[PDB]
Amino acid sequence: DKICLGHHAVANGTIVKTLTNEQEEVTNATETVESTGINRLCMKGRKHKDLGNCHPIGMLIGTPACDLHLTGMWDTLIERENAIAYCYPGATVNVEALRQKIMESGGINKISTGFTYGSSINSAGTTRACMRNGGNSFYAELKWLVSKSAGQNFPQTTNTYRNTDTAEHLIMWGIHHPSSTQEKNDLYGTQSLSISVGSSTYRNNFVPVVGARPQVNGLSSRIDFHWTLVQPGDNITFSHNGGLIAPSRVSKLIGRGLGIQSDAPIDNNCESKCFWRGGSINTRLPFQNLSPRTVGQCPKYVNRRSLMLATGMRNVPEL
């Protein structure tokens, strides 16, 4: 006459590691490291903007590729590989700081500078490198100022933008670096070129540099871009006599949003809070091994394929 105590066991158990044993067999275990993820951008519940082949910088200066993205509001901004910033060859000083500001914003408004130019200035310069409707054009938010009468000295000019708003504005301008002395003389004259820019909080001077260089989009000239923030109630004055690519609108970055750099296609039917280059990560698990580079609210990246957490007792099957 007897009664016995016992625990269960299972035919096929699973291995986990403990403090004393890397090969401990247990009745059940569950994953703690997410390994799968979704190869799409889960955008459900987000007011997103897919920039397509438009680069964030292009939004501020008005590259043709960004014509549908000159203003808007969003909580999520999506940047794609090989997006276009510059139709005319050139580069932006302090570019990664500017791209990160845009990629943090929740929108852009544009505000006219109201700049006007005297009769001896042709303000409608265009180029075959920036095309609209298959014809020569220019950056939408900027104006290529040249001497109306070719070869003549570009007049000494002043233009002031006034920020009457209650938030900071972002103003961008370019400097033209011609390909040859002859080109320089024809566009702006034989005088020495000097562009100075000043606000209450910013001061800088630029000199167009004539230089041989290789052709990009068929052109050896360059337009380099510069930018600064203009505080509420402050003014910024451009003093220039040739070589300024002048702003016709300034931008205002509005609120906050999440910036994502990914080539994954967008999925409007699933939602997510964590993104990487290859898509989204949707998991309750505290760790993931998908990528070290993520944005949003993410599981912590770990250097392991698998970490099993025991969810049962030691497995002791019958001999």
């Binding site: 006459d1 007897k2 009664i3 016995c4 105590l5 016992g6 625990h7 269960h8 066991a9 299972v10 590691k17 403990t18 403090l19 004393t20 401990e24 247990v26 569950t30 703690t32 490291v33 940047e79 794609r80 590989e81 997006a83 990664e96 791209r99 990160q100 999440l258 910036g259 750099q261 990914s262 280059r277 309750r284 698990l285 505290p286 760790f287 070290p292 580079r293 993520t294 944005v295 949003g296 609210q297 993410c298 912590k300 990246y301 770990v302 250097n303 392991r304 970490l307 099993m308 957490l309 025991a310 969810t311 049962g312 007792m313 030691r314 497995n315 002791v316 099957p317 019958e318 001999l319």
Partner: protein
Amino acid sequence: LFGAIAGFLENGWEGMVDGWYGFRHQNAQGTGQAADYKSTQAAIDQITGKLNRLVEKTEFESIESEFSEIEHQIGNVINWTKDSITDIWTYQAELLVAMENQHTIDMADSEMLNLYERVRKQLRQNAEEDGKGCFEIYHACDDSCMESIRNNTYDHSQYREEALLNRLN
């Protein structure tokens, strides 16, 4: 470790499926198998408590451009920092699971021992332990008496005088 599971209990019962811990018995009427609900739930509840801590869940932005070059020196500082953070989380993840698994196995062992000890003090002087997790009962115990042992309703003093005579002779 509490000495029961993978200890003085030779092995687990694959045929038990309605609980983690349970009773097997043999008497005149035959043999029977019943799981124990209360010990089985004590274990399972502790496991689900760990699992809850596991799925408890800061917004990060990008600091490393995917599609454009990063200045080399700051790109090296970021790589060093990110790799150092990742070494820390990897270590923490390995430690969590190892320490948690250790504890889970020993807590399960503990609940087995506690059921074994509850029955032992219940049976009092009417039974003796065989050392393999069984209690040799020194009186006749029919199927209702067995259920009396599982529901913690067994009154020892009812069989005591008879049990003692059998233990002593």
